[PDB]
Amino acid sequence: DIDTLISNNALWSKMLVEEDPGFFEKLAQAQKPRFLWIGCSDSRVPAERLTGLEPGELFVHRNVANLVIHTDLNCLSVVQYAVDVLEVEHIIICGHYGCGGVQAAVENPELGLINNWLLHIRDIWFKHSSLLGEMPQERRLDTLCELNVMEQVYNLGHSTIMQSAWKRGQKVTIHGWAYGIHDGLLRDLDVTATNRETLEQRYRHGISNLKLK
Amino acid sequence: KDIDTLISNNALWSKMLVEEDPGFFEKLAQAQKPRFLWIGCSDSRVPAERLTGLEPGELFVHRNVANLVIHTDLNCLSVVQYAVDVLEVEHIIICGHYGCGGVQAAVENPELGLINNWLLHIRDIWFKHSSLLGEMPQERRLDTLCELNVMEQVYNLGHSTIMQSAWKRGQKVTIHGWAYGIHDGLLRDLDVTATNRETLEQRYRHGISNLKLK
Amino acid sequence: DIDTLISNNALWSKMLVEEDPGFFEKLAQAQKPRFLWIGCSDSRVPAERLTGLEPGELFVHRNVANLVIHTDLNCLSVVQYAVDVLEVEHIIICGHYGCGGVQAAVENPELGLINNWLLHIRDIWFKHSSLLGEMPQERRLDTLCELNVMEQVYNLGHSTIMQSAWKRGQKVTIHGWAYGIHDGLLRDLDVTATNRETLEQRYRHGISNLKLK
Amino acid sequence: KDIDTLISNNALWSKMLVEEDPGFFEKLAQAQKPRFLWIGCSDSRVPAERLTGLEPGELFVHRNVANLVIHTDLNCLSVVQYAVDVLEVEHIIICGHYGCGGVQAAVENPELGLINNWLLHIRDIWFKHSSLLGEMPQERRLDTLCELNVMEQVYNLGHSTIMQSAWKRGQKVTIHGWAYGIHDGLLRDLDVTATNRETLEQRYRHGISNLKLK
Ligand SMILES: [Zn+2]
Ligand SMILES: [Zn+2]
Ligand SMILES: [Zn+2]
Ligand SMILES: [Zn+2]
Secondary structure, three states, X not given: OHHHHHHHHHHHHHHHHHHOOOHHHHHHOOOOOOEEEEEEOOOOOOHHHHXXXXXXXXXXXXXXXXXXXXXXXXXXXXXXXXXXXXXOOEEEEEEEOOOHHHHHHHOOOOOOOHHHHHHHHHHHHHHOHHXXXXXXXXXXXXXXXXXXXXXXXXXXXXXXXXXXXXXXOOOOEEEEEEEOOOOOOOEEOOOOEOOHHHHHHHHHHHHHHHHHO | OOHHHHHHHHHHHHHHHHHOOOHHHHXXXXXXXXXXXXXXXXXXXXXXHHHHOXXXXXXXXXXXXXXXXXXXXXXXXXXXXXXXXXXXXXXXXXXXXXXXXXXXXHHOOOOOOOHHHHHHHHHHHHHHOHHHHHOOOOOOHHXXXXXHHHHHHHHHHHXXXXXXXXXXXXXXXXXXXXXXXXXXXXOEEOOOOEOOHHHHHHHHHXXXXXXXXX | OHXXXXXXXXXXXXXXXXXOOOHHHHHHOOOOOOEEEEEEOOOOOOHHHHHOOOOOOEEEEEEOOOOOOOOXXXXXXXXXXXXXXXXXXEEEEEEEOOOHHHHHHHOOOOOOOHHHHHHHHHHHHHHOHHHHHOOOHHHHHHHHHHHHHHHHHHHHHHOHHHHHHHHOOOOOEEEEEEEOOOOOOOXXXXXXXXXXXXXXXXXXXXXXXXXXX | OXXXXXXXXXXXXXXXXXXXXXXXXXXXXXXXXXXXXXXXXXXXXXXXXXXXXXXXXXXXEEEEOOOOOOOXXXXXXXXXXXXXXXXXXXXXXXXXXXXXXXXXXHHOOOOOOOHXXXXXXXXXHHHHOHHHHHOOOOOOHHHHHHHHHHHHHHHHHHOOHHHHHHHHOOOOOEEEEEEEOOOOOOOEEOOOOEOOHHXXXXXXXXXXXXXXXX
16 A cells, blocks of 8 residues: 555665665666667566666656657657757567556557557558568567567658657657567567668568568 | 576566465465556666565556646646546555656756656746745755655646546545655655645645755 | 737627627527537638528537547547537538648658647548548648548547537537638538448448549 | 438538539648647637638637646647647637536546546635635636636646747747637737746736736
8 A cells, every 4th residue: 555655665665774874875866768669558677677677767758658759748758858859769569468457458448548659559550461460369469569569660760850860960869569478588679670661660670570580 | 687588587587486485376366456656757766566566467558758747738637537437546655756757857947858848847837936046055956856846746736637536426536646765765744635626726835845845 | 910900899899789699698598509510720710601501509619620539539529528417419520622731740840849749630641541541732731621621520439529429319420521722512421320330331431432522 | 410411511511612622622622731729628618710710721729627727737738839839829728618518527526536636736726716706606616717828828838848948049929818708709818918937927927817806
């Protein structure tokens, strides 16, 4: 309960204050994050734990099914601030196998308001219908999870924010990853782009190397 | 740390667990709906998992700049609706933190670009409480605004059709407004906890009143 | 100038007050609109003029390139109010040939913020690349204008707002139209749907009857 | 009127023009950028073309419920940005109208569903001016709110990065706040016209002050 959490915070804080009174000293030392993590609200496994990144190195955004919608100002505001103000060098979009958002999109359950958000994933399911169709029933949702991350990476790269940052020569690299709850091992979908040209090439080869695998 | 470093940490981290504690992945595999929805800032100075001492999978999370719950932001509203109507979280926490770069930039409109539009929502608050903040010892305004902001977002959340509907349906959901600083990482309950429509209107005023009289 | 407009309003009002003092009396007579028109901000030719509809019969929404984005709360709020509150019986999405939004999307000119909005049209251009590709250069933009309207109609029909209204049995029909500035003659794209089932069928046959024509 | 009726009107209407006045389509064919951006309500009780007496193609238009210019609404902001930076409109008009169903529903929160979230933005205003409206003769509040709303949206527009940037670039753009009623269809300039950042802050207060002292 809320009481338990409050208790935890107290103890947790107390402990650190003693053992490592410097812990809060480091944090007090303004360290601009160098990475922007865009993941799902499910947050099955915190980004910090998966990567060993320490708090302060990560600027974070989370929504249902880790989407980067062309016109979602919430995510775009996070991206623009991180890129233009914090000047992060890396942006990572991470999905996860078994994601409830991804599943709900396909198993179209009348969940309410949230379904509108999920229609963006449904567009993807239909876009890659042949590929998804030509494969085992049990492999489709996971493949869709990967297709989603790749499509969002593509959207991120085409945002005016990224196009303008690359055009002016700023150094920003975007990545697309995914992981399962059975080992928490990150899988690089290999759609890493450092400019507008590689974005296209990596998108193309990524989608095609799935049809081959 | 370059990308390859992060991937290296994960590989090793996962290997040790797989061996050392396979139980970790079993707990995770066990589909247990989150009970809390955390709405924090993208700055994420101290991860909510650390702060609350919760295990992964116990929290449904949403993060945006300066932790806002804008009346018409479908991103945050969709997270909320899914959590409440689908995952049925019992608690929703909006947590801010003193020193937030968003809150600061909002009052110092540094011409940061696109992000400024999002921050005008904090500026509205800065002006709304101009007297309370004007009678403030300057160097204590940004921290106050930080708390004022959290309270306003809690207010907006309680007023969302999502929340009004849930409460009317008689569903058990409590919303909280917290804050903490990076000197102790200690959470301060802003005393704006609401469990229904009535409590919402009251606790809200009796949350702002505190500061304007203390 | 602003002065001219103000002058016009005065005269226009004065005139009517005399000739037809009842004009404002009818308006004063609360007449819930029966149609919702969703068109482009260009508004080359006002909806009222194209259809002969009189003010008050039309509830209206306008954005660049007449889009109905899965997650655009502005348009969705107009739709939900019109459907659930005003109970309009008809919703019409109307595009127009030569639309600057449609052209800008393809001729990808770095126009600023607006380009993010237009990425939704670009998705369509690429979705129907084969069809568009297998046709005259001069016919592509106009065809894209039509494809856009059909895709937005499809989006509208899949919104939770429409799905829930149809499921509960409310009578709502959605249409997709377009017109050119050379004759202002409305062309029915024929994707009219009265329920969730006809929506799918009309979408399918509409897209396919274009490839044939 | 059923759909087929509307299509019939168009067919006939177009035929007569094609014959009677072919010049109409020539004027239209002549690409002449709009000079005004009109932001009105979806109610559209009286089309702006009628109100201003403008020809088609002279106005770039945007309509939403209760004519709002929300800080973070990308729909309206994209229309604005395109009009200002691309079409280079010289004037932007935000026009409200007394009796607006959105303004009314906002203060009477009838549990209309999704639309209520959008209307919370008007409610914020209703509360913001609680005294001015509290010292109002009740039956005159909704019309006041209507005007207050327009002024607030004009304020939000002037503060958008889009507008701030344009003005800083030294681009000539003027924003206006109007309103009218369906008894005379006469436009009332709410006196909140702004041509730059300075004028914006001033005219804004000197627009609200009028009402709170008159
Ligand atoms: Zn997920
Ligand atoms: Zn922050
Ligand atoms: Zn257009
Ligand atoms: Zn209205």
